Amino acid sequence: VLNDILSRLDPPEAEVQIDRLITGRLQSLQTYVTQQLIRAAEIRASANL
Amino acid sequence: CFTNVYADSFVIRGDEVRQIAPGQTGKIADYNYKLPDDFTGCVIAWNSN
Numbered sequence A: 001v002l003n004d005i006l007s008r009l010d011p012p013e014a015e016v017q018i019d020r021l022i023t024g025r026l027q028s029l030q031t032y033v034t035q036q037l038i039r040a041a042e043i044r045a046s047a048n049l
Numbered sequence B: 001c002f003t004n005v006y007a008d009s010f011v012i013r014g015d016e017v018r019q020i021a022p023g024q025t026g027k028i029a030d031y032n033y034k035l036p037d038d039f040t041g042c043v044i045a046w047n048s049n
Helices: A002-008 A011-048 B016-020 B029-032
Strands: none
Touching: A002 A011, B016 B029
């Protein structure tokens, strides 16, 4: 929970924690987007067929 | 080289020397002198008993 980190820790370490969270969430989003791209290529092949 | 150099001089007690640093809290940091979290520069302290 981002809000708990913001409210609980001091900014110097909350910044590192939110950096970790942002990296993780960005990686998850990138994985989802790549999977969507591949599945959409599959569906485009199906639609061409 | 730098475009701005600002020597800030004052006196504290030894236990409070730790408070003169970015991201610190306490009497001195909260109410007397507060550095920015992204402070760039040097802090120098020496006993003057």
